[PDB]
Ligand binder design. Structure first.
Ligand SMILES: [Mg+2]
Ligand SMILES: [Zn+2]
Ligand SMILES: [Zn+2]
Ligand SMILES: [Zn+2]
Lengths: 549, 174, 105, 84, 93, 171, 98, 268
RNA sequence: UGCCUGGUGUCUUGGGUGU
């Protein structure tokens, strides 16, 4: 309900289909063509149209709306642009696979070196998994070193000898045994040659090789048009009050576009092959390092400060990468952290919460006819008096802040509204200590608001948490819904976790001076007078009011 | 908003020329293809409706709903007023006016005979349902006129077009 | 394998319930061969690409999935976690419908 | 097709703890959204407590759909599942 | 709310709490996907109430999803590297 | 052209309506939300057959929002014009740029460039009309026109007709 | 401008010693020039030419301004240092050790 | 490795692909928290002690049930059908002893974690119904035999009438049925525990209900629980042992640090 | 009648705290 209304139906993802992007699709989904290396028009606001900061790509400024969708910064997802490459270049992530495919097929007729006549080849084709199918087909066709123009009847081959391909950085060398020993020639396999060879692969051969005709076509592994991500992917940062800093991806895209312009200019004017080779190799290097800057066997691309460029591949790997650092585990709202202390006078499933933390955190309670009076009282009390409230949320989703409202007493609550009231007693909250070695390290307690600034625990629960009070800190997470509150109170509650499934024995017991005192108190020669017995009996909450003889 | 029983239709690479709507070429698109599926997934044919059949069905359904809403206890204006929604009321009023002012067959038995003639005929066993609906709707009088109005019937020269037209004119109430 | 694992665990007098080690050694030997608990053992399964890439070798797995046009059916728990959906686990292992028959009372 | 007939239902006849928790949460949310209550409320005001009271009396108007691994499912009414 | 806490929440079996922690109490986002191409290329204009996928040239078969903003960023970064992750709301077998 | 189609609708119900009369209420909600609407994919939905005996099935509770989602399948009468189709019409307005006709719920605009030249627009005539020696087409006059193009809008359809070929014009 | 209060600043944009400060209060007032907009159309000199770059006190801290130092850096520009003082009394949760 | 493993509604343990890891969780379908160390009484002891404890003879007077513990001791001696029933019970007990002693537990260990604590149930029944005093029981032997026999068929782990389902259900409760028959023998019930009728139906109902309560719940994410339960001890801990040996095991190293054999020689 | 403000870099590195 926090999102503006959209008439499109709301559904959930059921399948993720992977594949490569065809140049046709890249051109189709694009909204603008990027050609001018200058980021800024004239350093007078209004970034140059057709440049790397075109307003059609999306908006990252509060007062500027996207020129493509018309939505604000909070709603615009960003729109892609495309950059046409003067000469096709290798995709750095697919070079070994490109080499394998070149080994599997003939470089002239564009057909497989083996056919279903071979029983082993038919057996390999019979398998289902594309990766294992390709592995088997490569293991077979690797040995076959000559194309056959005749059946081993014409099989469709051209009879040419198949070259042997070797990898060297981003370049592939193909060595032909041209016609005992003679002079063989090894010549460079340019990306364009491989591309126009791959375009002639039949769909049946493509399927036999493990590629998919609809989604992953082999010639799409060579980049001919580059997609330019929106500024949302590469946001700029204001280093100081005046000068903002371009992102690493923006600088790399500027370098790539400059190289493209250089190649285009050189091609039309005059063509010394040495210069063409140098400039095209520079373009290949820039495109490769834009997506992977840890290519072993060659120096990395460096910034002007000397630090290596943060390629897109580096964004996704490691503890701090996308998957581990932002998707599997992320920072969350509605949480608190402070030092823990012990309280002998707390029930097992109770946690003592400071007043300031109780005021800061909140729980949105729906206004009904069972609690409208109490919620109106909370709204009147305001965000500084306990019990109180912080916000009132209407049905449409608008939030009314009670700090900046001059007419808080002039607010009437309608059924279905939400009041973000303060944290109160007996609210279930999840409580956690790191490292979370087992599932008893996260348990749900009941809130009890107390003075002073430390979380307070019954000392029996210090065993499952592996916690003591010499400076440890623990995390508290507040559920924000009725469903989540029910889950916490019915599944993770402390009483339900007393017996562990690891060794079918309790994880909580009497500990420390309570254990010492129950040993001392139950000795055979410990006798208690009447007046002390009365006090000791009154202390038991469950005592039934009958004193034993 | 409303979704057809036909789903999927994911991305491919081939592009076909039988995708654009065209009445003359009898290319009605995927959602109006000759083969359809019901709620049980069984085979189903495209169901066209002539103005006579459409008028009969709409009148029957509207009067059934009007009778049901009154506890099971004829005027087109009242029948339109039965429905809910001002825009819906206007739309049904316009459709009823069109059907009434161009109703070739206002009788159930005349429409039944016309449908029997246009379906059970040996020549009409190949006729597309859209062609049948157009023939029963436009009320053409001549073979040349029908062919000009309906280009599809030009390629179907195995049809007793003139005598069928005369039969329709006879069945048409003067 | 179970005997060796139990020998390692119980040397210092610790006790772990049988069913946990049984599950572990049934996972390690379910394919007909010993499946090591490493990337070379786990990532060489037929599980979804999104689930496999979340453990190790993320970018290489994603390229291999793209080139091979892998299809992920989003049945795992990691896939549903990273897409912000109700995982098919625990309280999400079923569906709740509305009983129009009972509401007639 | 995918639905399993009531006579051939082979899953457990008891309400598992996950099903109990989810049912209580959903019913509490629905009550908090002004759904009709099918039991008499003495002095209770907490939606979760009203949901628990409804569950104890077998008055929750919800159906559990248990998904088998092959895709077929069994529909169990919360009034016919045994609760501890 | 790191990975070990996520594993503890899985062990407890509380799927709703995990979904709420990772979506509502964090980066929740709404996107539109084409029902044909499966890409997040729909140019949606909510105020004018018109949705349109230029590549597939459709205006109807369009759905909206609630996904973490980090997931949207990951898919866009994948598209920046010529990898196309297509999200579909129905299974095919 | 009119057709019979099997359509489906997704209906979301708020928990406040979880009563014994849930099914009938869903039925009237479907009728109010489908009758008379205009979808570009299908055209115009005019009526729903068997409107009081539509199966609604079992609604699924949306996790986290409480509301139930119902899948309603029904059979309805749908009208949709097609490119290159000749249909009857009634002229609704006469203007120098052309005349507007009505084909059921659809309003069709025919420009002068698609009208035969002999049908010169006469503004002095009462009412003004596009008339020839033997033809006079004014407001309320039956016309037979061929639909050439259809324009798709959010919830509206715009069609363009022509009378420049044979067996067209006034009828 | 910052959401704090600027009423504790002196004429020179520096707070004076002996003044009690709370969280988010502004202890150093600094502005940076900005190219003026077309507001000179009809604004009676009340058009924004400068942008705020003030230094607020830390949100969780409060105390007494103890000593304010004003001098020039190596480059000849103004340069200030403000020292804040508070007393911390032991309470539940403070760490001690033998 | 173990995250996507979950107990499904048919009892099997499957991963996300649907592949079966186990056909029944823990090979008995129970929850890890609902088991306790119990002694199976038919395993230990000499043959004479076993015979003395479990055999009942209705022909010899001094080898029969004591007359002061049962009201109907007069019309018991000399009955042949009741002796047939007792002989069937004793043969079942001997078969259980052989199965446990020769197949399952060869080394004779009889203290194993099993569901529903029987000793606690019996002493609860004794406290509830005041089973003290020298009063004679009114519990006939056929009631004991038929009640225990019927109870051993209501411990449902798997529902269904399929023959393979019935075979799996019978397999899943073999050890527990052996425990129950070891405890609820005729002689032990009439003499050692001195239960009356009402205590007997109470014990049977309680056993059935507790067993139903001790099963595993579909939707358990048992893979994560197992991974945590194995990794938790490792944080608090001539042959290789400890973390290096665990690392060798998990990696499936080809060349371990200290390879060894345990060659056993022939009896002579 | 003179009428009230929410908006906060990034990247490295170091030293620490609880297990
Ligand atoms: Mg400590
Ligand atoms: Zn935009
Ligand atoms: Zn060749
Ligand atoms: Zn699309």
């Amino acid at each position: 309900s926090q999102f503006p209304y959209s008439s499109a139906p709301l559904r959930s993802v059921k399948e993720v289909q992977f594949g490569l992007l065809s140049p046709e699709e890249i051109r189709a989904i694009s909204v603008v063509k990027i050609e001018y290396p200058e980021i800024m028009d004239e350093s007078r606001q209004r970034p140059r149209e057709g440049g790397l900061n075109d307003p059609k790509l999306g908006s990252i400024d509060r007062n500027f709306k996207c020129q493509t969708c018309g939505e604000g910064m909070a709603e615009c997802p960003g729109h892609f642009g495309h950059m046409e490459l003067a000469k096709p270049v290798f995709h750095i992530g697919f070079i070994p696979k490109i080499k394998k495919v070149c080994e599997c097929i003939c470089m002239n007729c564009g057909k497989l070196l083996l056919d279903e006549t071979n029983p082993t080849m038919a057996q390999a084709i019979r398998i289902r998994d594309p990766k294992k199918r390709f592995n088997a087909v490569w293991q077979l066709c690797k040995t076959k070193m000559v194309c056959e123009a005749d059946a081993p009847v014409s099989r469709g081959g051209c009879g040419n000898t198949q070259p042997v391909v070797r990898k060297d950085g981003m370049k592939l060398w193909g060595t032909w045994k041209k016609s005992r020993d003679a002079q063989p020639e090894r010549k460079l396999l340019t990306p364009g040659e491989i591309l126009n060879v791959f375009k002639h692969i039949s769909p049946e051969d493509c399927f036999r090789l493990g590629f998919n005709e609809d989604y992953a076509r082999p010639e799409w592994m060579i980049i001919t048009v580059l997609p330019v991500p929106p500024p949302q992917v590469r946001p700029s940062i204001a280093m100081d009050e005046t000068t903002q800093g371009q992102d690493d991806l923006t600088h790399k895209l500027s370098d790539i576009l400059k190289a493209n312009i250089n190649v285009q200019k050189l091609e039309m004017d005059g063509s010394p092959q040495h210069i063409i080779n140098e400039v095209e190799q520079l373009l290949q290097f820039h495109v490769a390092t834009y997506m992977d800057n840890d290519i072993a066997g060659q120096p990395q691309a460096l910034q002007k400060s000397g630090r290596p460029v943060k390629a897109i591949r580096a964004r996704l790997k490691g503890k701090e990468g996308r998957l581990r650092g932002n998707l599997m585990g992320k920072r969350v709202d509605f949480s608190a952290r402070t030092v823990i202390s012990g309280d002998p006078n707390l029930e097992l499933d109770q946690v003592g919460v400071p007043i300031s933390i109780a005021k800061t955190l909140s729980y949105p309670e729906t206004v009904t006819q069972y609690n409208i009076h109490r919620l109106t009282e909370y709204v009147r009390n305001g965000p500084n008096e306990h019990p109180g409230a912080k916000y009132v949320i209407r049905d449409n989703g608008d939030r009314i802040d009670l700090r900046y409202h001059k007419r808080a007493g002039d607010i009437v609550l309608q059924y279905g509204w939400k009041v973000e009231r303060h944290l109160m007693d007996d609210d279930p909250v999840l409580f956690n200590r790191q490292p979370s070695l087992h599932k008893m390290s996260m348990m749900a307690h009941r809130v009890k608001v107390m003075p002073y600034s430390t979380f307070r625990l019954n000392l029996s629960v210090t065993s499952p948490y592996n916690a003591d009070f010499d400076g440890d800190e623990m995390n508290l997470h507040v559920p924000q819904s009725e469903e989540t509150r029910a889950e916490l109170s019915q599944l993770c509650a402390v009483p339900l976790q007393i017996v562990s499934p690891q060794s079918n024995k309790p994880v909580m017991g009497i500990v420390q001076d309570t254990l010492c005192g129950v040993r001392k108190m139950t000795l055979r020669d410990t006798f208690i007078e009447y007046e002390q017995v009365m006090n000791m009996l009154f202390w038991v909450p469950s005592w039934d009011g009958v004193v034993p003889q | 908003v409303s979704t057809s029983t036909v789903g999927a239709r994911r991305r491919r690479a081939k592009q076909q020329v039988d995708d654009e709507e065209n009445a003359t070429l009898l290319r009605l698109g995927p959602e109006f293809a000759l083969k359809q599926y019901d709620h049980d997934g069984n085979e189903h044919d495209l169901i066209a409706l002539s103005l006579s059949e459409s008028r009969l069905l709409i009148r029957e359904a509207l009067k059934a709903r009007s009778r049901a809403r009154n506890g099971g206890v004829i005027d087109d204006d009242e029948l339109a007023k039965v429905t809910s929604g001002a825009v819906a009321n206007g739309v049904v009023k316009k459709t009823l006016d069109y059907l009434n002012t161009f109703a070739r067959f206002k009788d159930e038995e005349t429409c039944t005979a016309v449908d029997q003639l246009l379906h059970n005929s040996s020549d009409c066993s190949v006729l597309h349902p859209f062609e049948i609906a157009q023939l029963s709707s436009l009320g053409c009088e001549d073979v040349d006129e029908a062919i000009t109005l309906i280009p599809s019937l030009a390629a179907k020269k195995e049809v007793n077009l003139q005598r069928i037209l005369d039969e329709l004119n006879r069945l048409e109430d003067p | 394998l179970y005997k060796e694992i139990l020998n390692v665990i119980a040397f210092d007098g610790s006790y772990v319930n049988y069913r946990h080690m049984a599950l572990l050694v049934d996972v390690m030997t379910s394919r007909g061969y010993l499946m090591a608990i490493t990337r070379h053992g786990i990532n060489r399964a037929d599980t979804g690409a999104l689930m496999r890439c979340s453990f190790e070798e993320t970018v290489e797995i994603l390229f291999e999935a793209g080139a091979a046009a892998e299809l992920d059916d989003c049945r795992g728990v990691s896939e549903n976690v990273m897409l912000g959906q109700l995982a098919p686990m625990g309280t999400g292992a079923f569906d709740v419908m509305i009983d129009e028959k009972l509401l007639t009372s | 097709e995918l639905a399993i007939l009531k006579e051939e239902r082979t899953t457990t006849p008891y309400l598992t703890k996950y099903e109990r928790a989810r049912i209580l949460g959903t019913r509490a949310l629905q009550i908090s959204m002004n759904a009709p209550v099918l039991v008499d409320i003495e002095g209770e005001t907490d939606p979760l407590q009203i949901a628990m009271k409804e569950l104890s009396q077998r008055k929750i108007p919800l159906v559990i759909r248990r998904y088998l691994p092959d895709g077929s499912y069994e529909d169990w009414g919360c009034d016919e599942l045994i609760v501890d | 709310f790191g990975e070990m806490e996520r594993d503890c929440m899985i062990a407890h079996g509380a799927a709703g709490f995990l979904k709420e922690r990772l979506m509502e109490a964090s980066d929740a986002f709404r996107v539109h996907v084409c029902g044909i191409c499966g890409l997040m290329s729909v140019i949606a204009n909510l105020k004018k109430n018109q949705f349109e996928c230029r590549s597939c040239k459709n205006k109807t078969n369009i759905y909206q999803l609630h996904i973490p903003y980090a997931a949207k960023l990951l898919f866009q970064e994948l598209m920046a590297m010529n990898i196309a992750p297509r999200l579909y709301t129905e299974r095919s077998g | 052209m009119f057709f019979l189609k099997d359509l489906s609708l997704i209906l979301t119900l708020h928990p406040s309506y979880f009563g014994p009369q849930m099914n009938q209420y869903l039925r009237e909600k479907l009728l109010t939300d489908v009758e008379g609407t205009c979808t570009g994919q299908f055209g115009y939905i005019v009526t729903v057959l068997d409107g009081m005996n539509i199966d609604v099935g079992k609604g699924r509770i949306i996790p986290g929002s409480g509301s139930a989602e119902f899948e309603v399948k029904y059979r309805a009468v749908v009208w949709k014009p097609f490119k290159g189709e000749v249909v009857d019409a009634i002229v609704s307005n006469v203007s120098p740029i052309g005349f507007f006709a009505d084909v059921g719920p659809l309003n069709v605009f025919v420009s002068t460039r698609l009208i035969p030249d002999n049908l010169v627009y006469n503004p002095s005539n009462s009412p003004p009309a596009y008339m020839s020696n033997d033809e006079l087409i004014t407001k309320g006059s039956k016309v037979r026109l061929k639909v050439v193009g259809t324009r798709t809008d959010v919830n509206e359809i715009y069609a363009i007709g022509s009378i420049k070929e044979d067996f067209l014009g006034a009828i | 401008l910052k959401h704090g209060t600027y009423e504790k600043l002196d004429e020179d944009g520096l707070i004076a010693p002996g003044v009690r400060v709370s969280g988010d209060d502004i202890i150093i007032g600094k502005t940076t020039p900005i190219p003026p907009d077309t507001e000179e159309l009809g604004q009676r000199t009340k058009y924004h030419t400068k942008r705020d770059a003030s230094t607020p006190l830390r949100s969780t801290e409060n105390g007494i301004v103890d000593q304010v130092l004003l001098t020039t850096n190596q480059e000849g520009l103004k340069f200030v240092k403000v020292r804040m003082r508070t007393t911390k009394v032991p309470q539940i949760g403070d760490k001690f050790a033998s | 490795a173990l995250e996507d493993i979950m107990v499904h509604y048919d009892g099997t343990t499957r991963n996300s692909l649907g592949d079966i890891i186990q056909f029944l969780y823990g090979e008995d379908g129970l929850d890890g928290t609902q088991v306790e160390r119990q002694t199976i009484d038919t395993i230990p002891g000499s043959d004479k002690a076993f015979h003395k404890r479990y055999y009942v003879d209705l022909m010899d007077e001094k080898n029969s049930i004591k007359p002061d513990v049962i009201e109907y001791a007069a019309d018991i001696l000399g009955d042949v059908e009741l002796q047939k029933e007792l002989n069937s019970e004793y043969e079942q007990l001997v078969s259980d002893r052989k199965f446990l002693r020769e197949i399952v537990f060869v080394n004779g260990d009889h203290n194993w974690p099993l569901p529903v604590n029987l000793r606690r149930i019996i002493q609860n029944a004794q406290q509830i119904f005041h089973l003290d005093r020298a009063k004679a029981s009114d519990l006939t032997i056929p009631e004991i035999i038929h009640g225990v026999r019927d109870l051993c068929k209501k411990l449902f782990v798997l529902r269904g009438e399929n023959e393979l389902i019935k075979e799996a259900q019978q397999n899943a409760t073999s050890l527990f049925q052996c425990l129950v028959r070891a405890r609820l023998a005729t002689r032990r019930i009439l003499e050692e525990f001195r239960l009356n009728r009402d205590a007997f139906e109470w014990v049977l109902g309680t056993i059935e209900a507790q067993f139903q309560r001790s099963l595993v719940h579909p939707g358990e994410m048992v893979g994560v629980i197992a991974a945590q339960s194995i990794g938790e001890p490792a944080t608090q801990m001539n042959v290789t042992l400890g973390v290096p040996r665990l690392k060798e095991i998990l990696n499936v190293a080809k060349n371990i640090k200290t390879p060894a054999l345990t060659v056993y020689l022939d009896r002579e």
